[PDB]
Write a protein that binds this ligand. Structure first.
Ligand code: 2GO
Ligand code: 2GO
Ligand code: CLA
Ligand code: CLA
Ligand code: CLA
Ligand code: CLA
Ligand SMILES: CC(C)CCCCCCCCCCCC(=O)OC[C@H](OC[C@H](C[N+](C)(C)C)C(=O)O)OC(=O)CCCCCCCCCCCC(C)C
Ligand SMILES: CNCCOP(=O)(O)O[C@H](COC(=O)CCCCCCCCCCCC(C)C)OC(=O)CCCCCCCCCCCC(C)C
Ligand SMILES: CNCCOP(=O)(O)O[C@H](COC(=O)CCCCCCCCCCCC(C)C)OC(=O)CCCCCCCCCCCC(C)C
Ligand code: HEC
Ligand code: HEC
Ligand code: SF4
Ligand SMILES: [Ca+2]
Ligand SMILES: [Ca+2]
Lengths: 145, 854, 193, 192
């Protein structure tokens, strides 16, 4: 005997919405990416018309709070679909060469710290668990070649 | 067994003499070739690089020499058929190439002559010797037997073939010759005095570097004739790296004046001994060369150690090595980072190695002379105090046991502090304790206006405490500007952007408005966490260094202190004014506050400029002991304190087996209790009785000293090369090290990985890495309690192979017996392998270049 | 091992460069060959081949200690940065060969798992010069001293990171045989840096 | 086959008297390691070598050379993904290991357990017994001088040769295989 289980602690997650485990949500890809898309887009508008009433209004409250801390949404630098803006030098997430030459762990700190001149730091805006969700959503923008 | 035991002491004087003379001639030949390999047509390598700073300081290697030569001693000098100066007339030669060539040829001519003369003393000793026994693999050539049966160096012969006509030193009737090694101590040191004069005259008149105070007013440089004090380094005394005129005894002209100072002193101490030679009863047994061999070999080892210390400090920042950094040093196609310091570190660590090896060996040869006194029954009769002072076994156990204790306490302190601060730097939660890191946040200037959310406790001092986030009057979480942090505040780790400390959530402000004693001229809020920054002060050398240094720099230290104090007051008042602004509430009250910080801005600017410039001046003062890569003061660090404790404790750990060689070569307290006695100096054991008895002999104690000493020797290598020795995991780029202006390459383990990024860039260095790693672990095959297994299995292999030979018809296979190393020869070769495996890998750490910030 | 090293390439002169300044580049104190037979050819030859900013730099000059060395405040003037290909090549290949080869390969195509690969066009197109400075200065990934891509803010100067930034854009679309040459740097600079 | 007699024993008439004896030597050059217990320990060590072949291969190292780089021209042209090459693998994976502070603590403890096995496995037990004895005498002298009764009969225990070989194999094994856990725990970096 030893690991009587293993005392690793409780998992950090995002905000709780009543009646729907947030800890669980943070490991279930379809839940975490729904919250990543909300953060990414700055609205609840592109969310599946199947979204529940409680969900759609919890997201809005999340956004409204973030709007008071001058949070700037990811889309529209990077667009709703990726592959940003050459003008602004905003990264194109659809590109496979950009995707292969980034690890997901590495990507994290570039969102936390910001990246050179224009891409802003998000360490005081978002939690490290909300950055993890966004790294996962950006992964799904990849196209071939 | 005896193959390395062919030549054992005592020997007769003519044979020692003659072999030293022959070896001296041989070394002069090798140096002569090193002079040839220094010529400018070759690549840089480690051999020619370790001599170039010295040849620059001597004037023989000239960095600014570009012209090619075509006639210099006699009419045949561009290039010519069959070289004209054989194998060298292919390339363009400069004057430094010719100077190098000539000094090479001179060292090979003297060397060959000394080899011949040494042979005359060595073999004319024995009455002569025939050509085929001198060269010995000369009778194998056929049709040249007759040639190899002549006798050279005979006592009788015509002038070009004599050895010693009288047969020995003792028989030759030249009444100047001294007759005992103590009487010879006087001529040997007059002789060394004469050598010092030779060197001084060669430096003054051949190399043209006269002695202080007779140095020239003018010296020729590549830019014309200049005055000595403005002529740069190799030509004159101006040091162009540090921007100063050199002290006269920091030039080579200083070294030529010491040639005469030391030569006069040796001549006079030798003439004193001529008239009152050493005569003590405590010295008389030292005429036997077995006994003196101990004394001389251990002394020589100490001399090497002192060469390392003296050479390291004296030459760490000298222009001869820094000049290397200006040449365009390329080794195995690379380009080296700071070659100056790399070659300097190699030479001093070379000498430290030699130091250890000769102190350890000299003591072993000592234990051999004492063991023979015990075998022969004479130990008990010895009359010198240098033996009898240590004859008592109760005193020997107290000597050994109290140095074991002193070792225990210093090594527990050092290694325990290393472990503590590596725990701190890693933020490790042990359940019973959370280790915490150093973190800093700037409180002044523009940084001081960045806000954070703060959890602020109510009253730290009382339990049943509680805290709350700092809010606004309406109840929202207010952002606290770093300028306004207080002791006790907690800021979330995630919002400072810190991963890497997942077991806790907050960083705590422990000190505010902190200004490093030695570091960046900035103001911080700090978490000290568990990081022991006070431990730098737990070093006697911190205080001596900083005291001498304060006494020498006391006025600029005082003006710096006062400029810091004025800036702190001005920053504090700026923070008041900024806060009144932020807490205005009336567009009028805002506007008026803003008006008063505007009219106080100038003079905060001025207090900051004043502080910055005084701090820059103070940090440009000359070093005493602890220095920069320039030659400027640094304060002592945790690194320097740990090195200090580690030198005390780790050299005792290494040298305790030498004490055991000295006292217990024959009987130790374990042995005496069983009534045992060590019968030889090299037996491996006496078997399984009493639990097991491997490793008690003096040859084995010798091997243990060497392995144990690997540890203080690696601490020295890591320290020389820029590693952090005070933790295991330290990285160069982190907040503690940047705020305190510290440069390092590693952290014990972290250094191993980080330097190897550099090693990997060189294919020749990585092949050395692979091989040196193969050599070490094979030593484990020889050191483990395993030799019976190996002999039993080698017998199975022998049998099989002879079977195959019978079955197959192979006569040479049909009697094969594989040799398996017995226990003593295994411990010897295992130690040889363990030592050469490690120190070929340590060479690599020096040879990737030196990467401490300058 | 010793002595039988080769002949030195005639193009690598040993003719000496001026010494590294004692004064800090960030100082507020007071701010920041001859005609002898072959001395002019040797100086002109040292001016292309022997690097001037290879040595670790004074401790007060490192980018984390420089007031204008943070990613937010550094000046990336494209005219000064892509001015001289000799210089980008002279400096960035020495710095790169020393510091960056270990993990990114001798070809600069990636050695350590997940490491960058500078020849990849998709990676080139989606990075700014200022972006490349940020990741050298900060490192990439979570860890002490940067992550798996280590931080350089103690270690390198802002001027040293800028030679690195310009050199790294010569990797674009090259094959996986060693490092960019003098004419890779030059074709990179002609096609607007 | 050789638990009682090997052919080297049988030429001498020897007969191994028990399964765990340390030796019988210095005779015939020395005999340490002939018992069955010791052959068990030498199996465990020798087997560390094929096992580490298995670990490097599972976790994606390249085992056919010592310095393969990840994207060298050969690997790129032939679509091979690997993490390192014998030695290079070691330094390549440890840069990933360094980014986790729990795994770097495990790395430190693992290294210390192992090299201490060398104390126990080198031919040195007599040296350790005779020094331990000096240590006991000294501590008892301090007890008697300072009047400290708990310390006037200290006798430091020093393992005999058999138990030194047992705990030396234990320490060697566990050192190595905590450290191997790390090569797996760091991540699987083969990109396929
Ligand atoms: C790090 C990159 C690379 C990798 C691939 C690597 C791996 C490994 C492995 C493996 C399977 O992974 C092994 C098994 C291994 C083996 C070796 N390496 Zn090794 N190795 C590398 C590289 C190197 C290098 C360059 C070197 C070794 C050196 C050595 C040596 C180690 C020889 C030895 O026994 O050394 C004891 C000394 C040590 C550990 C250095 C201690 C430094 C420190 C600053 C001392 C001061 C502080 C201490 C806490 C002690 C205080 C108390 C005291 C003074 C009494 C052997 C061949 C060797 C060395 O450290 O020698 C002293 C050396 O120079 N190695 N090494
Ligand atoms: C940057 C790398 C880093 C540093 C800090 C480091 C340094 C050092 C030093 C030093 C002073 O420099 C030392 C002394 C050292 C020591 C060790 N390290 Zn160590 N070490 C590092 C890292 C690690 C890590 C993560 C690991 C070790 C592992 C180990 C272990 C290894 C113990 C041992 O004996 O292991 C034998 C097995 C080996 C060497 C692996 C061989 C693999 C290979 C793929 C097998 C097949 C190919 C061969 C040619 C096969 C022969 C053919 C046939 C018989 C199978 C010990 C504690 C250990 C290990 O190798 O265990 C098998 C391990 O897992 N180490 N190591
Ligand atoms: C410096 C010492 C150190 C510390 C502070 C930790 C701490 C940790 N270990 Mg590691 N560990 C260590 C050394 C350490 N370990 C060593 C030497 C080994 C080899 C035996 C391991 C093997 C290891 C494993 C396999 C695991 C951890 C895990 C853990 C975590 C939960 C531990 C726990 O539940 O304890 C309470 C339990 C006991 C006290 C014993 C039961 C924690 C982060 C677990 C984790 O997942 O973390 C990521 C985990 O699975 N530990
Ligand atoms: C380089 C590693 C190395 C090698 C090759 C060996 C070889 C061997 N050991 Mg030794 N051993 C080693 C390290 C190694 N050991 C270590 C680290 C220890 C301590 C634990 C030991 C402890 C030890 C014990 C106690 C015993 C052995 C035994 C054996 C033999 C096994 C019988 C056999 O099966 O033949 C098969 C042979 C092989 C599988 C080896 C092929 C050879 C190699 C790889 C070529 C060697 C290259 C060499 C390093 C390069 C230098 C050559 C140079 C000219 C280029 C075998 C010859 C047994 C023995 O029988 O003794 C005679 C035995 O009882 N080993
Ligand atoms: C794989 C083996 C290998 C190879 C191919 C080389 C290659 C070389 N070595 Mg390295 N060397 C090696 C292993 C190797 N070495 C080992 C194991 C050591 C440790 C003892 C060294 C220690 C070493 C030093 C200290 C030096 C080199 C030098 C050299 C170079 C000149 C060689 C020479 O003069 O040879 C002729 C040699 C002989 C004929 C034997 C004498 C050459 C690049 C020199 C150099 O400068 O490198 C850039 C040099 O100074 N060698
Ligand atoms: C961690 C490594 C380590 C340590 C601390 C020691 C300690 C010692 N060895 Mg062993 N030894 C080692 C490894 C070590 N050795 C290795 C690798 C070998 C193979 C060569 C040997 C082979 C060996 C021989 C043949 C002999 C010894 C002897 C000694 C003792 C010397 C007497 C003395 O100097 O007092 C001073 C004490 C110190 C200097 C060390 C203080 C305690 C240390 C620092 C830290 C404790 C660390 C430990 C890992 C902590 C775990 C604690 C637990 C709570 C976590 C000393 C007790 C001699 C002896 O007398 O026998 C008893 C002896 O004869 N050593
Ligand atoms: C240091 C180097 C620079 C090389 C040195 C020179 C030689 C190089 C080339 C290799 C030489 C190999 C010679 C091996 C040999 O013949 O060994 C024979 C020998 O002695 C037995 C008799 C002498 N009785 C015993 C009669 C007096 C003899 O032959 O002279 O041996 C040994 O006993 C030592 C072991 C030598 C190793 C040979 C093993 C070869 C492996 C074969 C295994 C598989 C079979 C089936 C082929
Ligand atoms: C990256 N650069 C780091 C060095 O920077 P920097 O230039 O600032 O500073 C000097 C230190 O460098 C030395 O100078 C080391 C030379 C090593 C060769 C020399 C190493 C040899 C050290 C000791 C040798 C012991 C032998 C003889 C037993 O930093 C010093 O203060 C060192 C002073 C050494 C004195 C310590 C005194 C301890 C007493 C030992 C007692 C031993 C016995 C009882 C058995
Ligand atoms: C008559 N004499 C010879 C015949 O008998 P013989 O040799 O079997 O006697 C031994 C020998 O002496 C040692 O073997 C030395 C131990 C002390 C070194 C001391 C050094 C140890 C430190 C090593 C740590 C290093 C690791 C962590 C890398 O017999 C043993 O010790 C058998 C081993 C059993 C030990 C069990 C340990 C469990 C205790 C854990 C709980 C204790 C506390 C937490 C309360
Ligand atoms: C105002 C523009 C802007 C906004 C808002 C913005 N970004 Fe960026 N971002 C940029 C620009 C410009 C870059 C290019 C960075 C550089 O210089 O290399 C970039 C770069 C990146 C990269 C690539 C980083 C890398 O390391 O290679 C990621 C990922 C990224 N941004 C994610 C985000 C996410 C997630 C958000 C919102 C949470 C976001 N960005 C918000 C403009 C923006
Ligand atoms: C210890 C190994 C290591 C060293 C040393 C190292 N790197 Fe890297 N590098 C990496 C890894 C791993 C990545 C991938 C990071 C990620 O995405 O996870 C990387 C990525 C980068 C990137 C891309 C960053 C981005 O955001 O896209 C740049 C630029 C970089 N490295 C440059 C350099 C330069 C210049 C040097 C030398 C100064 C250097 N590297 C040294 C390992 C290293
Ligand atoms: S194993 Fe070797 S050293 Fe140990 S008792 Fe037996 S013969 Fe002696
Ligand atoms: Ca180095
Ligand atoms: Ca892995």
């Amino acid at each position: 005997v030893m690991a009587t289980g293993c005392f690793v602690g409780a998992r950090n997650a995002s905000e709780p919405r009543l009646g729907s485990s947030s800890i669980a949500a943070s490991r279930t890809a379809p839940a975490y990416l729904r919250e990543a898309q909300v953060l990414y887009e700055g609205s609840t508008d592109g969310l599946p018309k199947d979204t529940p009433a409680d969900e759609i209004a919890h997201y809005k409250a999340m956004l409204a709070e973030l709007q008071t801390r001058n949070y700037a949404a990811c889309a529209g630098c990077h667009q709703v679909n990726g592959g940003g803006n050459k003008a602004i030098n905003a990264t194109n997430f659809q590109d496979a060469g950009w995707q292969a030459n980034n690890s997901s762990p590495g990507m994290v700190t570039s969102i936390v710290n910001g990246k050179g001149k224009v891409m802003p730091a998000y360490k005081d805006k978002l939690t490290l668990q909300q950055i993890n969700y966004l790294v996962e959503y950006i992964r799904r923008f990849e196209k071939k070649r | 067994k005896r193959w390395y035991q062919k030549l054992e002491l005592p020997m007769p004087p003519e044979r020692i003499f003659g072999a030293h003379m022959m070896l001296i001639g041989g070394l002069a030949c090798l140096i002569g070739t090193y002079f040839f390999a220094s010529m400018t047509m070759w690549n840089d390598g480690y051999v020619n690089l370790t001599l170039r700073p010295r040849l620059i300081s001597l004037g023989i290697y000239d960095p600014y020499d570009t012209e090619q030569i075509q006639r210099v001693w006699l009419p045949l000098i561009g290039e010519f058929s069959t070289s004209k100066l054989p194998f060298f007339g292919q390339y363009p030669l400069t004057m430094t190439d010719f100077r190098l060539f000539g000094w090479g040829c001179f060292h090979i001519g003297l060397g060959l002559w000394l080899v011949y003369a040494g042979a005359a003393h060595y073999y004319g000793a024995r009455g002569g010797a025939t050509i085929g026994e001198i060269f010995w693999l000369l009778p194998y050539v056929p049709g040249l037997k007759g040639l190899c049966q002549i006798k050279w160096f005979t006592p009788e012969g015509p002038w070009y073939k004599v050895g010693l006509p009288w047969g020995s030193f003792a028989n030759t009737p030249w009444p100047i010759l001294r007759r005992t090694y103590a009487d010879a101590l006087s001529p040997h040191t007059i002789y060394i005095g004469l050598l010092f004069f030779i060197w001084g005259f060669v430096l003054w008149f051949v190399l043209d570097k006269p002695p202080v105070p007779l140095q020239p007013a003018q010296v020729m440089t590549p830019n014309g004739l200049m005055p000595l004090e403005q002529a740069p380094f190799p030509y004159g005394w101006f040091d162009p790296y540090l921007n100063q005129v050199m002290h006269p005894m920091n030039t080579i002209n200083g070294e030529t004046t010491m040639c005469f100072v030391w030569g006069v002193l040796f001549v006079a101490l030798g003439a004193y001994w001529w008239y009152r030679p050493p005569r003590s009863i405590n010295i008389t047994h030292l005429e036997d060369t077995k006994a003196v061999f101990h004394v001389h070999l251990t002394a020589i080892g100490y001399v090497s150690f002192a060469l390392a210390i003296v050479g390291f400090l004296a030459l760490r920042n000298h222009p001869s090595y820094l000049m290397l950094n200006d040449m365009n040093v390329i080794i195995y196609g690379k380009k080296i980072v700071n070659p100056g310091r790399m070659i300097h570190n190699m030479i001093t660590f070379n000498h430290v190695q030699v130091g250890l090896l000769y102190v350890a060996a000299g003591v072993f040869h000592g234990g051999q002379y004492l063991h023979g006194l015990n075998i022969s029954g004479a130990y008990k009769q010895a009359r010198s105090k240098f033996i009898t002072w240590f004859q008592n076994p109760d005193l020997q156990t107290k000597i050994v046991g109290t140095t074991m204790f002193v070792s225990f306490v210093t090594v527990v302190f050092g290694y325990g502090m290393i472990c503590w601060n590596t725990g701190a730097e890693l933020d490790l939660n042990f359940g019973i304790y959370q280790f915490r890191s150093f973190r800093a946040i700037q409180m002044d200037g523009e940084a001081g206006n960045i806000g954070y959310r703060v959890f602020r406790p109510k009253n730290p001092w009382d339990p049943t405490a509680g805290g709350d986030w700092v809010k606004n009057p309406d109840g929202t979480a207010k952002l606290v500007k770093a300028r306004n942090l207080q002791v006790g505040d907690r800021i979330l780790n995630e919002e400072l952007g810190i991963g890497s400390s997942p077991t806790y959530s907050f960083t705590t402000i422990e000190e505010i408005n902190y200004k490093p004693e030695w570091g960046q001229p900035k103001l911080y809020a700090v978490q000290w966490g568990s990081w022991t920054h006070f431990l730098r002060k737990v070093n006697p050398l911190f205080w001596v260094d900083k005291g001498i240094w304060y006494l020498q720099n006391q006025k600029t230290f005082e003006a710096t202190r006062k400029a810091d104090e004025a800036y702190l007051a001005a920053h504090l008042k700026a923070v008041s004014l900024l806060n009144q602004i932020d807490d205005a509430q009336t567009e009028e009250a805002k506007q008026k506050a803003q008006a008063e910080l505007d009219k106080f801005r100038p003079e905060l600017e001025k207090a900051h400029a004043n502080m910055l410039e005084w701090n820059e001046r103070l940090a440009s003062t000359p070093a005493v002991l602890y220095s920069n890569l320039r030659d400027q003061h640094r304060d002592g660090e945790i690194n320097d304190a740990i090195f200090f404790w580690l030198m005390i404790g780790g050299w005792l750990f290494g040298f305790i087996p030498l004490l055991r060689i000295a006292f217990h070569n024959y009987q130790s307290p374990w042995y005496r209790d069983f009534e045992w006695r060590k019968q030889s100096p090299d037996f491996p054991c006496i078997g399984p009785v009493k639990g097991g008895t491997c490793g008690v002999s003096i040859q084995d104690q010798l091997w243990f000293c060497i392995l144990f000493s690997i540890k203080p020797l690696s601490a020295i290598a890591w320290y020389l090369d820029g590693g952090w020795i005070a933790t295991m995991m330290a990285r160069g780029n982190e907040a503690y090290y940047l705020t305190h202006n510290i440069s390092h390459t590693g952290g014990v383990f972290l250094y191993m990985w980080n330097e190897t990024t550099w090693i990997w860039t060189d294919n020749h260095l990585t092949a050395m890495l692979l091989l040196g790693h193969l050599i070490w672990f094979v030593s484990f095959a020889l050191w483990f309690k395993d030799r019976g297994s190996r002999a039993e299995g080698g017998d199975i292999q022998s049998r099989w192979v002879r079977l195959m030979g019978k079955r197959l018809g192979i006569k040479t296979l049909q009697e094969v017996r594989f040799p398996v190393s017995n226990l003593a020869t295994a411990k010897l070769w295992g130690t040889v392998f363990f030592y050469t495996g490690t120190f070929v890998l340590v060479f690599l750490y020096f040879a990737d270049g030196f990467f401490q910030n300058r | 091992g010793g002595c039988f090293v080769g002949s030195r390439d005639p193009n690598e002169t040993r003719y000496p460069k001026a010494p590294m300044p004692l004064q800090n580049q960030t100082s507020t104190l007071k701010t920041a060959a001859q005609n002898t037979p072959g001395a002019r050819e040797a100086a002109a030859l040292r001016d292309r081949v022997t690097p001037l900013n290879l040595q670790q730099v004074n401790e007060q000059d490192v980018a984390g200690n420089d007031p204008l060395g943070s990613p937010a405040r550094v000046v990336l003037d494209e005219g000064e940065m892509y001015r001289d290909p000799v210089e980008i090549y002279r400096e960035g290949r020495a710095l790169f060969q020393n510091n960056c080869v270990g993990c990114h390969g001798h070809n600069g195509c990636g050695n350590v798992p997940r490491s960058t690969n500078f020849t990849d066009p998709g990676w080139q197109e989606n990075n700014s010069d200022g972006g490349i400075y940020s990741s050298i200065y900060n490192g990439k990934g979570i860890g002490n001293g940067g992550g798996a891509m280590p931080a350089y803010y103690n270690q390198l100067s802002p001027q040293q990171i800028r030679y690195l930034v310009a050199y790294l854009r010569a990797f674009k679309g090259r094959q996986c045989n060693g490092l960019p040459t003098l004419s890779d740097v030059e074709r990179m600079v002609a096609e607007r840096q």
